[PDB]
Amino acid sequence: AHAPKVIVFISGSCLFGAISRSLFKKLPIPYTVVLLILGAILGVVASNVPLVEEHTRDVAHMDPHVLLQIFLPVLIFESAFAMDVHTFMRSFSQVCILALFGLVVASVLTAVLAMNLFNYNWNFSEAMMFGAIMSATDPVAVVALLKDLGASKQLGTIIEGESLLNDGCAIVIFNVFMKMVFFPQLTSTVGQNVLYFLQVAVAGPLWGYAVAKVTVFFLSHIFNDALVEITITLAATYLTYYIGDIWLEVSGVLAVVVLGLIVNAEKTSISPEVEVFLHRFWEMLAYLANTLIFMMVGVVVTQKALVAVDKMDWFYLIILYLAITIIRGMVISLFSPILSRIGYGLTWRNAVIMTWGGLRGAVGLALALVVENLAGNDVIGSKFLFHTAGIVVLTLVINATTIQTLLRILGMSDISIPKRLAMAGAVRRIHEGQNRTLNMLKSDRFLADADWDIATAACEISDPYSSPREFADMMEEARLRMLKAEKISYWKQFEHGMLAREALRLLVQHAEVAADEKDQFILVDDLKKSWQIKGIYPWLKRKLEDLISEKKIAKLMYKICHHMAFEVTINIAIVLNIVPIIMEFVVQDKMALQKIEDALRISNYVFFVIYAIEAIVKILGLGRHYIVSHWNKFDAFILVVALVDIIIKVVKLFRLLRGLRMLRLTKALIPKLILVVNGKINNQLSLGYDVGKGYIIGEEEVGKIIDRMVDNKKILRELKHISETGRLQVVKELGLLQREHPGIAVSVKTRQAIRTILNHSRETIHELQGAGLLDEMEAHKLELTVEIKMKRLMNAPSSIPPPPPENLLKNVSWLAGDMKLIDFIKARASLLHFDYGEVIVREGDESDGLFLIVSGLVKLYFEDYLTVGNVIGEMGVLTKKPRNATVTCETTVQVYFITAEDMNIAIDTFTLYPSLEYRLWRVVAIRIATPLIMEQMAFQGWTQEKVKLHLERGYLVDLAESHFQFNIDATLEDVILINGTAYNAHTREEIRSPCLISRTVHKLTFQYTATEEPRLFVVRNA
Amino acid sequence: AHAPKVIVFISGSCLFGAISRSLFKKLPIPYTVVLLILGAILGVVASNVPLVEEHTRDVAHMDPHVLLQIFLPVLIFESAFAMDVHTFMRSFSQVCILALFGLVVASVLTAVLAMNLFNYNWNFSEAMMFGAIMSATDPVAVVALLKDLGASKQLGTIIEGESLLNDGCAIVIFNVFMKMVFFPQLTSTVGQNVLYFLQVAVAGPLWGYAVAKVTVFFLSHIFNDALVEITITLAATYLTYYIGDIWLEVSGVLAVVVLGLIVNAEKTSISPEVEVFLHRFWEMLAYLANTLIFMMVGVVVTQKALVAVDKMDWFYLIILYLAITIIRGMVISLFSPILSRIGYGLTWRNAVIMTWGGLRGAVGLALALVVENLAGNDVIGSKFLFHTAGIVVLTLVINATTIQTLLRILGMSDISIPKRLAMAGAVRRIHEGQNRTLNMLKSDRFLADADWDIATAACEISDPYSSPREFADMMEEARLRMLKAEKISYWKQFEHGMLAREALRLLVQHAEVAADEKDQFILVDDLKKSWQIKGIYPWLKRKLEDLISEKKIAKLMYKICHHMAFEVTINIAIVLNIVPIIMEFVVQDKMALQKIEDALRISNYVFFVIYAIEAIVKILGLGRHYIVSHWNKFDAFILVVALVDIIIKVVKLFRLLRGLRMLRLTKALIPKLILVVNGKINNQLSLGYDVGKGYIIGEEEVGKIIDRMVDNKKILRELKHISETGRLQVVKELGLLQREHPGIAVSVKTRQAIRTILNHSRETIHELQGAGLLDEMEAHKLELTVEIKMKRLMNAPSSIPPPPPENLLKNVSWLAGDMKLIDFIKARASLLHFDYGEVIVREGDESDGLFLIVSGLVKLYFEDYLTVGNVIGEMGVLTKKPRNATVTCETTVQVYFITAEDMNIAIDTFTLYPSLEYRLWRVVAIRIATPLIMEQMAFQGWTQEKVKLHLERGYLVDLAESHFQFNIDATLEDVILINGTAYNAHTREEIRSPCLISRTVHKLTFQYTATEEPRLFVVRNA
């Protein structure tokens, strides 16, 4: 009897939505209109049958102040949570102009229409409510079509972002205008109106920003608990709206909009397994909200609205549908000159798509339902719902159905030739794979008698899309084929975790843009915008770093004055005193009690005494040097005011005390601002490194590919020249970014290193799990310890102080792990310094010693650049012959210099563990061996990272143990030569030094003359 | 003002649970007790502060009939949805005895205690409510501990299943006994009580079964719509409980229990991406329910319960906690003799774990809250909540905390040596991988200056666990090492999709069992239980197949009599008439109206006329043969009754009409029963094929492994003998299963073939996506078309009629794709037949022709067996020399025979497309080449499937084009010899025919003498 009947209607709507969504899947009509018809049916039968009324009443006639608080957060957050925020930011101004100003004109024009055309004789407030609910649009279908058809980035996000902002502001306007119709207030003082505007417009986004930054902070500290992450997201979403709208009178919708957008941006703080869950979770909740709303409309529209219609109302409906359509187009075209300059710009065809795709829906209907409940017996609620519902139906029946054909007409739905080629190739390879698999199964004793006619038909996959003049387009083939290769390399790096998605999309966008521009190649100056740091943050860092420059100053009191515990406790003491500060003012306001005032003022005296005591300790610690710092001068003012107020009207105390301790807390606040600024720079700088990395590695790989793909050498040379001229510019730019922000660069580099180690570490877990040497449960146990570390990686400090040179030597590849060897060369070492533009070494110079870059950049000339950590001379010291390249510093340089004579002693003394010479040779071997193997298979599916790891498993042969090296391929897969020359066993031909040994080679005869020591590199097969 | 305040409390409890679950993570105390303390705090402050009362009232004092309808479905379904059902079924009786009978004794004993010990003077009804809520247990923590510690399968599922059943029945008992206290009824007739019992006990599970089978049916037909799958699951879950409890008065909890269990069993009908979502989704909902309930308890217990406590109540609490503990142990021990026989049996230590781990919780508390609301001012609600809450606290404070130490004491928490070894090896390999990765990064120009001291520390992974007498244990090493290898192979097959999880767990369970038994090896007779079909289903199939044996009978009326459209429409006509049948009875019952009765009786006359017309058509079609079938005899009785009722008290009509059309519908019902029976056999048979496959492939792989791992040949021979003696028995059993159920076997084989093709087809999609030749969106588009087909695979008919022999030839590997060649040999072919035990061919026989098995089994003797589809003679016809093995039929056999003379003509005539001889050689090459490569790398991570595919890419060399074959390794990775012999180019040594060419071999010189045609197989490198 007392059961929750709402479970029936909610679950019933679930079934009805499933049915409508399953039947009308391949049909053009959207499933939502079917749901409206079903709700209307429920309404007519429920109008006579009493039994079903009881199971529909509690939801069909649900209160509006609950409709808003429950559904709108779901719809708005889901719309925000589904955004491609990065794109939305790269078009923010274009959206704001159309969504905000376009909304005002669209609604007002719609309002004047409703005042003048209709016979309802509405006033401007009601007409503005009408226009507000008319302007709200939910283009969930059109955006899907564009997403499927391609070329969606510059249009789908615009309509999606415009939709989000338009609903967000429309609710704001609707809330504003509902109150001057149903909740009229008489005060209407102008000053409060400005204050009223500030709350909804300004405080809302700020409330959401604060809640978001708090939320991500905790989420970044939750490890191995998915339920809590999901639960935190839910509670934050609903509390943000509820608190903002109900307790703060702040705009809930905008707070959620910002909160969803901020969280979407900060998804890295969320565990990936929860991220995928949340999207599908909020999508499901939005689906339920949509399905409910349409059915409630279908019920009430039939019970209450359609019974009060008049004959002419249909005339207004058609006219209104036409009006909003031309209104939207006029608005879009009117702003079009402005948009052409701001953002990507609108073509006339794209403008029509936005105009034609302005679908209405749940948000408009939800606000109409609010009016229906609020109007009661007034006709307005009926006709608001009538026209809102009708326009939703027409847009769904006409615009949602003809949009595909219109896209065909405009030539936008056409699949580009590259995509047709990709699909044809993919289908062909898949078809061959099945044929191979089919023959294998027919040879299986278990499956020999399966009905292959059924099998082949069931598994088949089908294509869903079923001279100067010569140079003028031969170059186009070179451009497109190079650009296509670049796109491939970017996808490679992304799939192996070397590259973030944001950098990948930036690179791909630039490649696509360059392809369309007829004579264009991808341009570094366009890429430079990614890593060029905006000056505000560096200026703020430089400025704030001065405010804590304690170096002007920097017997137990002297120790206590500097002890961190004392400072932290004093700061805390000030923090607690803030509660009395506000409490006294609030108590005075409420009193205007004495028992409370006396307690507070006694507490004030106690705090004055405490402040005197701590200041006395500080003064005793520093003596006359105490007052050197302006911070301590205000600390003296603290005692002045404390003594004055101890001796002794209320305002004279309030005004001084309100400033004292806020200012004294600013000192502890500044470092956090420094950290935040470092974080912003770290984010921008990290993306710059990724993009510069992507382009550099992309060019390095592509240069191997194009060398054999393009037919004409003249075309080849022009393209390769571009590649190097861009690569060196990027390298220089990225090297210089380090010097401006050393610590942040170190943080970036460390984070990449750990992330790369963990990724490959994770891969091994799946290797043995796939190999069965480790079970499912235990492998999962290890994988979690990896995952938590990855999350801990995010919380790494935004700035790491650069290690001193004495620590750099310890971490060198050929020095690490041998303390005695580290000490020997460290003791023998000396540190040099060089001025700007100075030459360090030059072509033909004797190799008298070795260099390590501890600071600065150096240009070489086969031009290249190097920076901190890079060793120079690792070959000359070994080959013992003149230096191979010039070394010029592009900035002031510091280097650790080891004289060749001392190093030679270290070389011929440190050989117990793997030989020092062997290690130095190994570093050289990998360096110059990588390009050879990359050339040999860059056109295949490998990346240079795996070539390095492929080589990393290898080692140098101990040639001293044999006069010759004979090949084998069972336990050996690749071999390269580095130094010296060998004689072929069969043909007696010589093989040159930096050459890969062809697989037709067997056995190599070396010789032990003193001119050179031949060096050879092998990688043993798995 | 009118906002939904409940959003605050729900979201507030979310935050409080997050806090408590985050702080008390590493502590021993569970987080739930912390939540209770927090709720108590909220209660005391809310008792004075009015503001927070308003935000706690609407939930803290929520109605009970909503508490049950909302939370219990979530808790019960989640507990059911989380089960390992297969294990739960393999222990169902053991759980039922303990959970059902143990519950009755545990509660009654608890009730007598409450009647006699306590001073409350309860009557048996109230005391039974007490015992019911006391017996409910939620061992969510203990099961987690066992899951982590290992050896959990035979104990965790028992406590989990016992818990599920105990809560399910406890609610049933609580519902029963609440009604005789708060809703007393006076009728109490015995006959209704039995009817009342039937509804709750019998109809509930049936209601859930019907809803489940309907649900999975639709879910199996939903393609590419995840939201609808999730939504359907939700609505089905809540409607099942709501309809069952409210409309049918049926036991909702048990219906949901069955529904959750059935759905969990039928998870294959659900898309995998939705399956993973649902578990985390229902887990989250259960988490919310738990967190809410504890806080509502903490609130009300402080407001209303604790204010009415007496001093002695604590004495009863302690005594009660002791009593239920010894009661549970006495029950477990008392049934222990029975359990030792039924199921796995209980050790004394395992019994204590069950006794000690009997934690109470939300379910007990939820039912106590119901009493608190219902008791009103009566003390009983206070003390019910007091003792329930206290026992929950004590079990959580004591049992949940000491359980780990007790497990240590009993020696159950000890990590077995094999797991320690696996963890040490896994950690070591991971540690080496990071070291390799670290050195690679130090050579990177971008990351050379990262603080490696930070990196190495952050990425490090640490071990979490930180003669006759010789023969008597050398054999143990052989046993364990063989058994360990078997376990590895099973994991291999599972990870590549060749093996289902159920078969994998069965095999692993048997391996573990055999390991513990001192002298045991895995035994086929133990495996036989998997594929031995229970006779009920074959008997039912055989019986029902007779009832539709139309062959006793099987001018337009003759055609119409057999047309399917006429039969379907007639059956539909009968289906519609059922509505009048029930409608007349219901109308008569309600009347006891005439305007309705006349319409129904007129409809009865019309339906009588229609039935006469259709029968007239049938009789005209068959003439005097019409009455030959008993179905048509009752069809004549239909006309008899129709004419009698047309001419003409109400009972005389009801009784006849109630039978006529139900019986006439049974005819259309029988085929569906046939299909269902086929489905049950298909499921059991499919698992048998998988397990037999797993053991056969496992033994084949292991025999390659152990041949070099065990040191003693005598041990080796004994182990290998076991392997073959099991393999041949399994092969024979699986071959014979086919003959008993040909069509179902064909369905199984076809389903495996398609699933294997799609899996490898899916793999290619990720290959190019990882290689970047296909983009993220388009690759995803193709992958969906693959996924939908996989779901369509489930709906494939359970039985496929075996194709006739004329279709078998077309699908042979070396015949397919060449119609003219198919026709030639098909025309030349002849079909033979052989009797049981007949010899087909024998050792030393001349190869006069070739055989193909179209029916039956054949034994060979290197013993082996073959069955349908297997060709025999594929070498003798080629080598043209005597036959190599005996061929004896183990059952009646049919074979397609091609005489060698005709085939030779086909061989030397069909050579335009790839040579017929080349194809026959290829089939032989793969067959005998696979074992060689398996031997060469079985100890590595490969499976024989990939060896076949590794070979499938290869081909036979065209030796006719060269006197010699010189090796290369850049575009070639493996080569094998099949026929003939070659001479080494370097050493001039001969290499034998069925031998892999060692990687030290270069160039092979063949000769063209007429004795043999040498054959060589190559696989080109990627």
**Exp. method:** cryo-EM
* Nearest in space to B135 (alpha carbons), one of B319, B329, B333, B359: B359
Residue A437 distance to chain B (closest CA, Å): 6
DSSP 8-state symbol, A1011: T
Instruction: Give dist(CA A757, CA B437) in Å, integer.
Output: 6
Q: Does B941 touch chain A (CB under 8 A)?
A: yes
CATH no. of B803-913: 2.60.120.10
Instruction: Give dist(CA A107, CA A122) in Å, integer.
Output: 14
Spatial contact of A245 and A251, defined as CB atoms under 8 Å apart = yes
Q: What is the full DSSP assignment across A527-544?
A: HHHHH---THHHHHHHHH
**Closest-approach residue (CA) in chain B for A1001:** B968
Tokens of A110: 């719609």
Q: Does A852 touch chain B (CB under 8 A)?
A: no
- The upper half-sphere exposure of residue B226, i.e. CA atoms within 13 Å in the direction of its Cβ, equals 18
Residue A7, Ramachandran bin (φ over 0: left; ψ between -120 and 50: alpha; else beta): alpha
Residue A189: how many CB atoms within 10 A of its CB? 9
Distances (CA, A) of B71 to A75, A722, B96, B282, B490: 26, 67, 25, 12, 41
* Burial of A973 per CB tally in 10 Å (0-12, 13-18, 19+): middle
Spatial contact of B754 and A458, defined as CB atoms under 8 Å apart = yes
Instruction: Give dist(CA A310, CA A383) in Å, integer.
Output: 10
Question: Residues 272-331, chain A: which have Cβ within 8 Å of B?
Answer: 277, 280-281, 283-284, 287-288
Instruction: Give dist(CA B457, CA B438) in Å, integer.
Output: 12
Instruction: Give dist(CA B177, CA B196) in Å, integer.
Output: 13
Under an 8 A CB cutoff, do B441 and A756 touch?
yes
- The upper half-sphere exposure of residue B154, i.e. CA atoms within 13 Å in the direction of its Cβ, equals 15
Residue in the structure block whose two tokens are 């264009």: A520
Spatial contact of A135 and A173, defined as CB atoms under 8 Å apart = no
Residue A1000 distance to chain B (closest CA, Å): 6
Report the run of H or E that residue B851 belongs to, with start and end.
strand B849-855
Contacts of B226 by beta carbon, 8 Å cutoff, 6+ apart: A280, B271, B273, B274, B277
- In chain B, how many H helices and how many E strands? 40, 15
Report the run of H or E that residue A172 belongs to, with start and end.
helix A153-179
* Nearest in space to A38 (alpha carbons), one of A23, A17, A59, A53: A17
Query: What are the chain A neighbours of B939 within 8 Å (beta carbons)?
Result: none
Residue B490 distance to chain A (closest CA, Å): 8
Instruction: Give dist(CA A64, CA A174) in Å, integer.
Output: 13
* Burial of B25 per CB tally in 10 Å (0-12, 13-18, 19+): exposed
Spatial contact of A688 and A744, defined as CB atoms under 8 Å apart = no
Tokens of A885: 């390249």
Spatial contact of A991 and A977, defined as CB atoms under 8 Å apart = yes
Q: Does B228 touch chain A (CB under 8 A)?
A: yes
* Burial of A635 per CB tally in 10 Å (0-12, 13-18, 19+): buried
Tokens of B271: 């898309």
Q: Does B450 touch chain A (CB under 8 A)?
A: yes
**Closest-approach residue (CA) in chain A for B1:** A246
* Nearest in space to A300 (alpha carbons), one of A378, A362, A381: A381
For B532, the 3-state DSSP assignment is coil
Under an 8 A CB cutoff, do A789 and B277 touch?
no
φ, ψ at B325 (rounded to 5°):
-70, -45
Long-range contact list for B931-937, CB < 8 A, 24+ apart?
B931/B704, B932/B976, B932/B994, B932/B995, B932/B996, B933/B974, B933/B976, B933/B996, B934/B700, B934/B701, B934/B704, B935/B704, B935/B707, B936/B996
Q: Does A655 touch chain B (CB under 8 A)?
A: no
Spatial contact of A230 and A285, defined as CB atoms under 8 Å apart = no
Tokens of A557: 């009191």
Which of B231, B282, B449 is best to mutate for the A interface (most A CBs within 10 A)?
B449
Instruction: Give dist(CA A106, CA A97) in Å, integer.
Output: 12
Tokens of A883: 């230096």
What burial letters (b/e) apply to B140-161, b meaning 16+ CB within 10 Å? Answer: bbbbebbeebbebbbbbbbbbb
Tokens of A619: 């003064």
Residue in B437, B866, B952 nearest the CB of A757 = B437
DSSP 8-state symbol, A236: H
Residue B217: how many CB atoms within 10 A of its CB? 12
Angle formed by the axes of helices A630-647 and A594-622, to 10°? 140
CATH 2.60.120.10 domain position(s) in chain A: 804-913
**Closest-approach residue (CA) in chain A for B787:** A459
Q: Does domain A6-409 have CATH number 1.20.1530.20?
A: yes
Residue B754: how many CB atoms within 10 A of its CB? 22
* Nearest in space to A504 (alpha carbons), one of A482, A486, A529: A486
* Nearest in space to A976 (alpha carbons), one of A914, A930, A918: A930
Report the run of H or E that residue A858 belongs to, with start and end.
strand A858-860
Residue in B65, B232, B786 nearest the CB of A2 = B65
Under an 8 A CB cutoff, do A228 and B807 touch?
no
- In three-state form (DSSP H/G/I as H, E/B as E, the rest C), the secondary structure along A209-234 is HHHHHHHHHHHCCCCCCHHHHHHHHH
Residue A680: how many CB atoms within 10 A of its CB? 17
Contacts of A614 by beta carbon, 8 Å cutoff, 6+ apart: A570, A573
* Nearest in space to A673 (alpha carbons), one of A496, A544, A853, A792: A544
Spatial contact of A584 and A615, defined as CB atoms under 8 Å apart = no
**Closest-approach residue (CA) in chain B for A441:** B753
Instruction: Give dist(CA A982, CA B166) in Å, integer.
Output: 81
- Residue B817 marked in a binding site: no
Topology classification of domain A804-913: Jelly Rolls (2.60.120)
Tokens of A395: 């847009």
| Binding site as annotated, residues of A for a 1,2-diacylglycero-3-phosphate | 2
**Closest-approach residue (CA) in chain B for A773:** B488
Tokens of B269: 């009908």
Which of A179, A222, A225, A449 is best to mutate for the B interface (most B CBs within 10 A)?
A449
Residue in B426, B449, B870 nearest the CB of A869 = B449
Dihedral, CA of residue A807, residue A811, residue A817 and residue A823, to nearest 10: -40
Residue in the structure block whose two tokens are 């709206």: A241
Residue in the structure block whose two tokens are 């043999």: B1012
When the candidates are 3.30.1660, 3.30.70, 2.60.40, 2.60.120, the CATH number that belongs to A919-1019 is 2.60.120
Instruction: Give dist(CA A867, CA A732) in Å, integer.
Output: 9
Which residues on neighbouring strands pair with residue A966, listed in sequence order? A1003
- Strands (DSSP E) found in A398-538: none
Q: Does A179 touch chain B (CB under 8 A)?
A: no
CATH 1.20.1530.20 domain position(s) in chain B: 63-409
Residue A974 distance to chain B (closest CA, Å): 10
Under an 8 A CB cutoff, do A772 and B488 touch?
yes
CATH 1.20.1530.20 domain position(s) in chain A: 6-409
- Beta strands B864-866 and B858-860 are antiparallel
Going across the sheet that includes B830-834, the strands are B830-834, B893-899, B849-855, B871-872
Spatial contact of A223 and A791, defined as CB atoms under 8 Å apart = yes
Tokens of A802: 């650069």
- The upper half-sphere exposure of residue B475, i.e. CA atoms within 13 Å in the direction of its Cβ, equals 14
* Nearest in space to B30 (alpha carbons), one of B362, B262, B300: B362
Instruction: Give dist(CA A863, CA A851) in Å, integer.
Output: 19
Under an 8 A CB cutoff, do B242 and A813 touch?
no
Tell me the residue length of chain B. Answer: 1022
* Burial of A192 per CB tally in 10 Å (0-12, 13-18, 19+): exposed
Contacts of A149 by beta carbon, 8 Å cutoff, 6+ apart: A407, A412, A413
* Nearest in space to A328 (alpha carbons), one of A144, A111, A105: A105
Residue B842: how many CB atoms within 10 A of its CB? 12
Instruction: Give dist(CA A91, CA A156) in Å, integer.
Output: 11
Instruction: Give dist(CA B224, CA B802) in Å, integer.
Output: 32
Tokens of A805: 């040179």
Identity of residue B824: F
Residue in B246, B792, B923 nearest the CB of A3 = B246
Residue A1022: how many CB atoms within 10 A of its CB? 8
Query: What are the chain B neighbours of A226 within 8 Å (beta carbons)?
Result: 280
Q: What is the full DSSP assignment across B286-351?
A: HHHHHHHHHHHHHHHIIIIIGGG--TTHHHHHHHHHHHHHHHHHHHHHHHHHHHHHSSS---HHHH
Question: Residues 769-788, chain B: which have Cβ within 8 Å of A?
Answer: 769-776, 778-779, 781-782, 785-786
Instruction: Give dist(CA A318, CA A393) in Å, integer.
Output: 12
Tokens of A217: 């902070």
Dihedral, CA of residue B441, residue B443, residue B445 and residue B447, to nearest 10: 30
Instruction: Give dist(CA B716, CA B732) in Å, integer.
Output: 25
Residue B401: how many CB atoms within 10 A of its CB? 16
Under an 8 A CB cutoff, do A786 and B451 touch?
no
- The upper half-sphere exposure of residue B232, i.e. CA atoms within 13 Å in the direction of its Cβ, equals 28
Residue A676 distance to chain B (closest CA, Å): 22
DSSP 8-state symbol, A801: P
Cα angle A560, A563, A568; round to 5: 110
**Closest-approach residue (CA) in chain B for A1003:** B1000
Question: Residues 814-843, chain A: which have Cβ within 8 Å of B?
Answer: 816
Residue in B69, B779, B813 nearest the CB of A3 = B69
Spatial contact of A3 and B69, defined as CB atoms under 8 Å apart = yes
Q: What is the full DSSP assignment across B157-191?
A: HHHHHHHHHHHHHHHHHHHHHHHTTTS--S---HH
Q: Does B932 touch chain A (CB under 8 A)?
A: no
Spatial contact of B813 and B774, defined as CB atoms under 8 Å apart = no
Question: Residues 65-124, chain A: which have Cβ within 8 Å of B?
Answer: 65-66, 69-70
Instruction: Give dist(CA A192, CA A202) in Å, integer.
Output: 15
Report the run of H or E that residue B1017 belongs to, with start and end.
strand B1015-1019
Query: What are the chain B neighbours of A941 within 8 Å (beta carbons)?
Result: 767, 770-771
Contacts of B960 by beta carbon, 8 Å cutoff, 6+ apart: none
Instruction: Give dist(CA A332, CA A342) in Å, integer.
Output: 14
Spatial contact of A570 and A632, defined as CB atoms under 8 Å apart = no
* Burial of A650 per CB tally in 10 Å (0-12, 13-18, 19+): exposed
Tokens of B113: 């205690």
CATH 2.60.120.10 domain position(s) in chain B: 803-913
Please give the interface size between A and B, counted as residue pairs whose CB atoms are below 8 Å apart. 394
* Nearest in space to A925 (alpha carbons), one of A895, A947, A942: A947
H-state helical runs in B648-741: 650-709, 713-740
Report the run of H or E that residue B772 belongs to, with start and end.
none
Query: What are the chain A neighbours of B746 within 8 Å (beta carbons)?
Result: 449-451
Spatial contact of B681 and B744, defined as CB atoms under 8 Å apart = yes
- In three-state form (DSSP H/G/I as H, E/B as E, the rest C), the secondary structure along A285-297 is HHHHHHHHHHHHH
* Burial of A705 per CB tally in 10 Å (0-12, 13-18, 19+): buried
Q: Does A442 touch chain B (CB under 8 A)?
A: yes
For B496, the 3-state DSSP assignment is coil
Spatial contact of A997 and A1015, defined as CB atoms under 8 Å apart = no
* Nearest in space to A284 (alpha carbons), one of A296, A295, A276: A276
When the candidates are 3.60.20.10, 1.20.1530.20, 3.40.50.10490, 1.10.8.50, the CATH number that belongs to B63-409 is 1.20.1530.20
Query: What are the chain A neighbours of B773 within 8 Å (beta carbons)?
Result: 422, 425-426, 488
